[PDB]
């Protein structure tokens, strides 16, 4: 079932600056008219996220830019797409991407946000594919090559109906879409927030906060994703399923949280309107720090510079004699309690190891000491 | 299940009731972390785990936060800041066949000690030493699992026991299960106490005008005080202000 | 309690086949995993085969897999070892070994009295 897409264009990745977006409400707390300082994961101010379009350029050897790559989800992902028309259809999440381990899938096929968790067996271009009928000008469901199989389905979860528009559009971006997905605590959290804007290149000046759309108690594996888009065959891409396929203009931008400190300011009348990245410079640190947007004349003491350490280094003394544990242990004859036997053990190197791993003792306990910690201590004396 | 394949159940939007299983004394332990079982049925939460296996008799406090043991390390570990509850009833009479029981076994070798709620399947040759296994068994090569020698003559200490452990999480989002209690209806502009889904306080509940947007539950103030909460079977928005009082 | 009896084998002209098998008394042969060794005089203990009612379900050596064939019966609770293609260098004894668990949490291998296997050029 599976279309095995070719003739790929090489394209080396494009960076674009992230500005002040990926700000998200970091709770279900609501605040107001404060400033509340926050350690989540987050995405810095200023970063590079990568981009990747969908276009095909018309003309001779006109360039066809169809970006469905596999990438690390790392931990967490911001994903922002400029779209006029919806060509993506949602994404896939997961490490083997096969039948053997469990995978999800979020498909927003314009009747419902449906999430499953399955161990899909994904084809090696996992897509979804509408043919246009052209007399009627109807787009339908016509190709789900995102899995092969479907199996022991975990979970599965649906939104609110509706019916959304894949036409084609022309003329400037309209709709920015920017989402967060975050799995920790065995929870997926989605959050979202949806703009209209009138550009045609980089993200707005304006800061959005990205309301919470969904959490999923699924606690699965995770450590790649990759997203779908929705490609149109017709009259203008002659040929079979393999060729005669094409996607309309869009674009979508990736990028990669990380634990920061940030300062958000909820305003008077609930909403979060803006935000300063602690570590991002010397006067954010300050801010931060003063607890406050605005900073007057004068020094303030902020953090503490320190070299950390490089490398570990042990010295330890030449003597590699093994201590004589089975003197005591391997022993047949044993005191008794009143007369009980005293054995010294020294100038040797003892291996606690095999003692605490060879499992024939029923009570092994330790006082004052972690057992597993006794293969890296070095004793003045022992009394056996 | 098995204690290193332990099942896992999820528990929520629906009423438990905690004291029957209390009052049934059909469970020979019933320990709980973090919470007293007699107020279990006042309490709201988040979710509830449940995680089921069969173990034997003398490891039934072998599972504990910051216990040690081949068990805690390679088969069920729980955190060192647990909460929740742990079950545990002989399982001789209802699991355990003449000749002994094996169907129920458990890790033995594992290359580090698991992480807590992680669910361990492979069932790869543990490499002891510095020989390689490349799936050959034997020296420094070792199978990681062993069978329960669940012999129905053998002591009680080694008989077969059930154990279920109840992992209740509790965040700041709308509760999911709820002990049984009864809903009453609310009063405003009086000085009451309050249980608002499993939060408690005492104050007076005011119309508010502060927007919740559809994924709040509940404003605090500066300090970790509920200034503003959102009612259940209403989705109205409470003021809550601490009841008049002064010095004389 | 726990015994286990070997039966078959014994002295075997070239081009023959052979099915030796291990009986298990006082417990199910249903558990964690039953093994197959065998030795030669002169030789040291290595492990050979072994079958498990978990995870994967038979392991062998290297130098032995996919050519020599094992199966249990829970019916008649027995382990079956079917040999084919014989070869001279085949000569040794055999044995089939369990890992028991007591309450003091000890592991013991028991094995068994074993067959004399020989093959004749």
């Known amino acids: 079932q599976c279309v095995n897409l070719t003739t790929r264009t090489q394209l080396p990745p494009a960076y674009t600056n992230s500005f002040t977006r990926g700000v998200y409400y970091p709770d279900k707390v609501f605040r107001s008219s404060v400033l509340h300082s926050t350690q989540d994961l987050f995405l810095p101010f200023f970063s590079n996220v990568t981009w990747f379009h969908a276009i095909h350029v018309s003309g001779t050897n006109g360039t066809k830019r169809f970006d469905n790559p596999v990438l690390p989800f790392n931990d967490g992902v911001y994903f922002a797409s400029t779209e006029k028309s919806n060509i993506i259809r949602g994404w896939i999440f997961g490490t083997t991407l096969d039948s053997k381990t469990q995978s999800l899938l979020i498909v927003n096929n314009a009747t419902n946000v449906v999430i499953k968790v399955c161990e899909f067996q994904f084809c090696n271009d996992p897509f979804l594919g509408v043919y246009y009928h052209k007399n009627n000008k109807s787009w339908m469901e016509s190709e789900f090559r995102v899995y092969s199989s479907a199996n022991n389905c975990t979970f599965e979860y649906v939104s609110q109906p509706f019916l959304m528009d894949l036409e084609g559009k022309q003329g400037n971006f309209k709709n920015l879409r920017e989402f967060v997905f975050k799995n920790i605590d065995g929870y997926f959290k989605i959050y979202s927030k949806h703009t209209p804007i009138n550009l045609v290149r980089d993200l707005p000046q304006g800061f959005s906060a990205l309301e919470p759309l969904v959490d999923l108690p699924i606690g699965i594996n995770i450590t790649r994703f990759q997203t779908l888009l929705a490609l149109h065959r017709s009259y203008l891409t002659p040929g079979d399923s393999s060729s005669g396929w094409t996607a309309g203009a869009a674009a979508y931008y990736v990028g990669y949280l990380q634990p920061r400190t940030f300062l958000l300011k909820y305003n008077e009348n609930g909403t979060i309107t803006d935000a300063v990245d602690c570590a991002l410079d010397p006067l954010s640190e300050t801010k931060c720090t003063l607890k406050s947007f605005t900073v007057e004349k004068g020094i303030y003491q902020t953090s503490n510079f320190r070299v950390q350490p490089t490398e570990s280094i042990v010295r330890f003394p030449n003597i590699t004699n093994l201590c004589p544990f089975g003197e005591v242990f391997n022993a047949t004859r044993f005191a008794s309690v009143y007369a009980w036997n005293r054995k010294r053990i020294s100038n040797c190197v003892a291996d606690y190891s095999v003692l605490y791993n060879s499992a024939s003792f029923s009570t092994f306990k330790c006082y004052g000491v972690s057992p597993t910690k006794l293969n890296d201590l070095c004793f003045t004396n022992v009394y056996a | 299940a098995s204690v290193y394949a332990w099942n896992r159940k999820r528990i929520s939007n629906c009423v438990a009731d905690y004291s029957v299983l209390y009052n049934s004394a059909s469970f020979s332990t019933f320990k709980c972390y973090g919470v007293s079982p007699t107020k279990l049925n006042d309490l709201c939460f988040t979710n509830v785990y449940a995680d089921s296996f069969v173990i034997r008799g003398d490891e039934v406090r072998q599972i504990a936060p910051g216990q040690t043991g081949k068990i805690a390390d390679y088969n069920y570990k729980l955190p060192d800041d647990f909460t929740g509850c742990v079950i545990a009833w002989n399982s001789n009479n209802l699991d355990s066949k003449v000749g002994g029981n094996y169907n129920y076994l458990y890790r033995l070798f594992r290359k580090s000690n698991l992480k807590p709620f992680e669910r361990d399947i492979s069932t790869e040759i543990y490499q002891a030493g510095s020989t390689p296994c490349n799936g050959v068994e034997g020296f420094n090569c070792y199978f990681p699992l062993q069978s329960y020698g669940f012999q129905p003559t053998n002591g009680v200490g080694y008989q077969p026991y059930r154990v279920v452990v109840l992992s209740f999480e509790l965040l700041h989002a709308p509760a999911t299960v709820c002990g049984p209690k009864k809903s009453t209806n609310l009063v405003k502009n009086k000085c009451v106490n309050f249980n608002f889904n499993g939060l408690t306080g005492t104050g007076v509940l005011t119309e508010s005008n502060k927007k919740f947007l559809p994924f709040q539950q509940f404003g605090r103030d500066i300090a970790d005080t509920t200034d503003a909460v959102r009612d259940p079977q209403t989705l109205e928005i409470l003021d809550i202000t601490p009841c008049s009082f002064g010095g004389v | 309690q726990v015994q286990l009896v070997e039966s078959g084998g014994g002295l075997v002209q070239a081009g023959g086949s052979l099915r030796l098998s291990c009986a298990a008394s006082?417990?199910?042969?249903?558990?964690?995993?039953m093994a197959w060794y065998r030795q030669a005089p002169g030789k040291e203990r290595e492990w050979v085969a072994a079958?498990?009612?978990?995870?994967?379900?038979?392991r062998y050596a290297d130098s032995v897999k996919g050519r020599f064939t094992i199966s249990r019966d829970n019916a008649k609770n027995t382990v079956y070892l079917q040999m084919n293609s014989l070869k001279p260098e085949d000569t040794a004894v055999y044995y089939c070994n369990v890992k028991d668990v007591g309450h003091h949490y000890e592991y013991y291998d028991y094995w068994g009295q074993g067959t004399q296997v020989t093959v004749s050029a």
């Open positions: 006082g417990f199910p042969v249903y558990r964690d995993r």
């Open positions: 079958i498990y009612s978990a995870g994967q379900q038979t």
